[PDB]
Design a protein around this motif. Structure first.
Motif, PDB file in Angstrom:
ATOM      1  N   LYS A  47       0.818  -1.204   0.000  1.00  0.00           N
ATOM      2  CA  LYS A  47       0.000   0.000   0.000  1.00  0.00           C
ATOM      3  C   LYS A  47       0.854   1.256   0.000  1.00  0.00           C
ATOM      4  CE  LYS A  47      -3.916  -2.421   1.935  1.00  0.00           C
ATOM      5  NZ  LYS A  47      -5.242  -2.285   2.611  1.00  0.00           N
ATOM      6  N   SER A  48       1.927   1.239   0.779  1.00  0.00           N
ATOM      7  CA  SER A  48       2.820   2.390   0.891  1.00  0.00           C
ATOM      8  C   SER A  48       4.233   2.053   0.517  1.00  0.00           C
ATOM      9  CB  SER A  48       2.825   2.935   2.316  1.00  0.00           C
ATOM     10  OG  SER A  48       3.625   4.097   2.395  1.00  0.00           O
ATOM     11  N   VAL A  49       4.932   3.075   0.066  1.00  0.00           N
ATOM     12  CA  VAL A  49       6.344   2.951  -0.276  1.00  0.00           C
ATOM     13  C   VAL A  49       7.217   2.865   0.980  1.00  0.00           C
ATOM     14  CG1 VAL A  49       6.781   5.416  -0.367  1.00  0.00           C
ATOM     15  CG2 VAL A  49       8.055   3.858  -1.837  1.00  0.00           C
ATOM     16  N   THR A  50       6.643   3.173   2.142  1.00  0.00           N
ATOM     17  CA  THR A  50       7.357   2.999   3.398  1.00  0.00           C
ATOM     18  C   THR A  50       7.183   1.644   4.005  1.00  0.00           C
ATOM     19  OG1 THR A  50       5.468   4.046   4.505  1.00  0.00           O
ATOM     20  CG2 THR A  50       7.418   5.409   4.045  1.00  0.00           C
ATOM     21  N   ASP A  51       6.295   0.814   3.474  1.00  0.00           N
ATOM     22  CA  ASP A  51       6.064  -0.508   4.031  1.00  0.00           C
ATOM     23  C   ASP A  51       7.328  -1.289   4.003  1.00  0.00           C
ATOM     24  OD1 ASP A  51       3.342   0.203   4.208  1.00  0.00           O
ATOM     25  OD2 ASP A  51       2.760  -0.970   2.436  1.00  0.00           O
ATOM     26  N   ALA A  52       7.569  -2.005   5.099  1.00  0.00           N
ATOM     27  CA  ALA A  52       8.753  -2.835   5.223  1.00  0.00           C
ATOM     28  C   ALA A  52       8.590  -4.125   4.415  1.00  0.00           C
ATOM     29  CB  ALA A  52       9.033  -3.153   6.661  1.00  0.00           C
ATOM     30  N   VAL A  53       9.721  -4.653   3.960  1.00  0.00           N
ATOM     31  CA  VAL A  53       9.753  -5.826   3.096  1.00  0.00           C
ATOM     32  C   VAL A  53      10.919  -6.698   3.446  1.00  0.00           C
ATOM     33  CG1 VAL A  53       8.575  -4.676   1.186  1.00  0.00           C
ATOM     34  CG2 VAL A  53      11.048  -4.724   1.181  1.00  0.00           C
ATOM     35  N   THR A  54      10.748  -7.982   3.174  1.00  0.00           N
ATOM     36  CA  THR A  54      11.755  -8.958   3.481  1.00  0.00           C
ATOM     37  C   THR A  54      12.493  -9.421   2.233  1.00  0.00           C
ATOM     38  OG1 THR A  54      12.259 -11.083   4.457  1.00  0.00           O
ATOM     39  CG2 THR A  54      10.061 -10.884   3.533  1.00  0.00           C
ATOM     40  N   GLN A  55      13.724  -9.889   2.403  1.00  0.00           N
ATOM     41  CA  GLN A  55      14.510 -10.403   1.261  1.00  0.00           C
ATOM     42  C   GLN A  55      13.712 -11.429   0.460  1.00  0.00           C
ATOM     43  OE1 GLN A  55      17.576  -9.236   0.058  1.00  0.00           O
ATOM     44  NE2 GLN A  55      16.691 -10.450  -1.602  1.00  0.00           N
ATOM     45  N   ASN A  56      12.957 -12.283   1.171  1.00  0.00           N
ATOM     46  CA  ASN A  56      12.007 -13.184   0.527  1.00  0.00           C
ATOM     47  C   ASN A  56      11.054 -12.527  -0.452  1.00  0.00           C
ATOM     48  OD1 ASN A  56      12.005 -16.051   0.871  1.00  0.00           O
ATOM     49  ND2 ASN A  56      11.885 -15.661   3.083  1.00  0.00           N
ATOM     50  N   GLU A  57      10.400 -11.456  -0.020  1.00  0.00           N
ATOM     51  CA  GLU A  57       9.491 -10.744  -0.880  1.00  0.00           C
ATOM     52  C   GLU A  57      10.224 -10.217  -2.111  1.00  0.00           C
ATOM     53  OE1 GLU A  57       7.476  -8.231   2.048  1.00  0.00           O
ATOM     54  OE2 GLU A  57       6.678 -10.121   2.800  1.00  0.00           O
ATOM     55  N   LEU A  58      11.464  -9.765  -1.939  1.00  0.00           N
ATOM     56  CA  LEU A  58      12.248  -9.250  -3.062  1.00  0.00           C
ATOM     57  C   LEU A  58      12.699 -10.350  -3.994  1.00  0.00           C
ATOM     58  CD1 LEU A  58      14.615  -6.725  -1.280  1.00  0.00           C
ATOM     59  CD2 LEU A  58      12.481  -6.201  -2.422  1.00  0.00           C
ATOM     60  N   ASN A  59      12.929 -11.548  -3.447  1.00  0.00           N
ATOM     61  CA  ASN A  59      13.268 -12.705  -4.291  1.00  0.00           C
ATOM     62  C   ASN A  59      12.146 -13.114  -5.220  1.00  0.00           C
ATOM     63  OD1 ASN A  59      15.810 -12.815  -3.100  1.00  0.00           O
ATOM     64  ND2 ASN A  59      15.167 -14.350  -1.627  1.00  0.00           N
ATOM     65  N   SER A  60      10.908 -12.728  -4.901  1.00  0.00           N
ATOM     66  CA  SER A  60       9.739 -13.157  -5.688  1.00  0.00           C
ATOM     67  C   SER A  60       9.642 -12.384  -6.989  1.00  0.00           C
ATOM     68  CB  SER A  60       8.456 -12.994  -4.884  1.00  0.00           C
ATOM     69  OG  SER A  60       8.187 -11.623  -4.635  1.00  0.00           O
ATOM     70  N   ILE A  61      10.354 -11.268  -7.073  1.00  0.00           N
ATOM     71  CA  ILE A  61      10.316 -10.439  -8.251  1.00  0.00           C
ATOM     72  C   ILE A  61      11.238 -10.987  -9.321  1.00  0.00           C
ATOM     73  CG2 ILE A  61      10.869  -8.182  -9.184  1.00  0.00           C
ATOM     74  CD1 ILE A  61       9.664  -6.927  -6.892  1.00  0.00           C
ATOM     75  N   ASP A  62      10.639 -11.405 -10.435  1.00  0.00           N
ATOM     76  CA  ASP A  62      11.386 -11.934 -11.584  1.00  0.00           C
ATOM     77  C   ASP A  62      11.227 -11.109 -12.851  1.00  0.00           C
ATOM     78  OD1 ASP A  62       8.861 -12.599 -12.412  1.00  0.00           O
ATOM     79  OD2 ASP A  62       9.337 -14.680 -12.883  1.00  0.00           O
ATOM     80  N   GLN A  63      10.446 -10.038 -12.784  1.00  0.00           N
ATOM     81  CA  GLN A  63      10.393  -9.104 -13.880  1.00  0.00           C
ATOM     82  C   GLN A  63       9.998  -7.739 -13.389  1.00  0.00           C
ATOM     83  OE1 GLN A  63       7.512  -7.501 -14.707  1.00  0.00           O
ATOM     84  NE2 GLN A  63       5.807  -8.922 -14.433  1.00  0.00           N
ATOM     85  N   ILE A  64      10.424  -6.727 -14.125  1.00  0.00           N
ATOM     86  CA  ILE A  64      10.030  -5.370 -13.861  1.00  0.00           C
ATOM     87  C   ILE A  64       9.828  -4.688 -15.183  1.00  0.00           C
ATOM     88  CG2 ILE A  64      10.783  -3.154 -13.034  1.00  0.00           C
ATOM     89  CD1 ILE A  64      12.328  -5.092 -10.947  1.00  0.00           C
ATOM     90  N   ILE A  65       8.652  -4.117 -15.341  1.00  0.00           N
ATOM     91  CA  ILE A  65       8.288  -3.460 -16.555  1.00  0.00           C
ATOM     92  C   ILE A  65       7.913  -2.047 -16.200  1.00  0.00           C
ATOM     93  CG2 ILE A  65       6.583  -3.335 -18.396  1.00  0.00           C
ATOM     94  CD1 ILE A  65       6.508  -6.472 -18.198  1.00  0.00           C
ATOM     95  N   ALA A  66       8.817  -1.113 -16.489  1.00  0.00           N
ATOM     96  CA  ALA A  66       8.646   0.251 -16.062  1.00  0.00           C
ATOM     97  C   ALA A  66       9.099   1.221 -17.122  1.00  0.00           C
ATOM     98  CB  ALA A  66       9.394   0.476 -14.773  1.00  0.00           C
ATOM     99  N   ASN A  67       8.485   1.155 -18.291  1.00  0.00           N
ATOM    100  CA  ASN A  67       8.835   2.105 -19.323  1.00  0.00           C
ATOM    101  C   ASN A  67       8.200   3.460 -19.036  1.00  0.00           C
ATOM    102  OD1 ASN A  67      10.212   0.006 -21.078  1.00  0.00           O
ATOM    103  ND2 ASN A  67       8.105  -0.761 -21.113  1.00  0.00           N
TER     104      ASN A  67
END
Length: 253
Positions: A28-48
């Motif tokens: 919900k927020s850009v301040t929300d805390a995140v774990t290395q696990n959550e970051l490992n789940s990202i396998d693509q980023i589409i930001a043109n």
């Protein structure tokens, strides 16, 4: 690597990019805390066209495979040095003036690399020496005027190479200091080549000497006045040859 839950805004200093990560993690927020696990789940980023000025923090996404950052305002890309699972990278329409030495030394699974529409003017030495799984490379619409002989050495599986709208004309003149530059040696599997809009006005026969799988060659919009003999004899698989907007006159006698 992160060892405790950390805010997104902290790892990813750039606002535009932080919000991107937020959206991909469904926070919900850009301040929300995140774990290395959550970051490992990202396998693509589409930001043109997302106005991203820096991708600092991307170091912590080890499993990115498909990265689309076209149309942003990136001036530096050193943070991709270690994304070893990267397979697709679009950095077109940014403001890259230059690349770090060895920025792609590790990206050995890379298959598509689009650097088009930047303002690159030269390439470091050994910039693509490791990329052996690469098949598509788009360097069009830059200001390339200088290439090292071994620049494309080791792109053995390269099939598409786009070098349009650059400034490579000088590289193919006998009057060139050190003679012509045969920067297409060993591209045995290349099938599409676009050399339009470079002010070419001559080219030796030896340039295309290795391009045996070539089927498509675009030489349009150059300054060619004639062609040499023996070129077509070598390019046995050539089906499309665009020579429009040149100056091909019948040889004077």
């Amino acid at each position: 690597t992160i060892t405790v839950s950390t805010p997104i805004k902290q790892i990813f200093p750039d606002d535009a990019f932080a919000e991107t990560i937020k959206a991909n993690l469904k926070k919900k927020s850009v301040t929300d805390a995140v774990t290395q696990n959550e970051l490992n789940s990202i396998d693509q980023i589409i930001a043109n066209n997302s106005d991203i000025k820096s991708v600092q923090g991307i170091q912590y996404l080890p499993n990115v495979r498909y990265l689309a950052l076209g149309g942003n305002k990136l001036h530096d890309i050193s943070a991709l040095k270690e994304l070893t699972n990267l397979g697709w990278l679009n950095l077109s329409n940014n403001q890259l003036e230059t690349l770090p030495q060895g920025v792609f030394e590790k990206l050995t699974n890379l298959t598509t690399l689009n650097l088009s529409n930047n303002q690159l003017t030269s390439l470091p030495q050994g910039v693509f020496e490791r990329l052996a799984s690469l098949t598509t490379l788009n360097l069009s619409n830059n200001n390339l005027a200088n290439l090292n002989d071994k620049v494309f050495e080791g792109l053995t599986n390269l099939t598409t190479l786009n070098l349009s709208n650059n400034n490579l004309a000088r590289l193919w003149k006998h009057a060139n200091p050190g003679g012509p530059i045969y920067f297409l040696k060993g591209l045995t599997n290349l099938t599409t080549l676009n050399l339009s809009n470079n002010g070419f006005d001559e080219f030796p026969k030896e340039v295309f000497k290795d391009l045996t799988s070539l089927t498509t060659l675009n030489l349009s919009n150059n300054q060619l006045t004639s062609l040499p003999q023996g070129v077509f004899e070598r390019l046995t698989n050539l089906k499309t040859l665009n020579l429009s907007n040149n100056q091909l006159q019948s040889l004077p006698t």
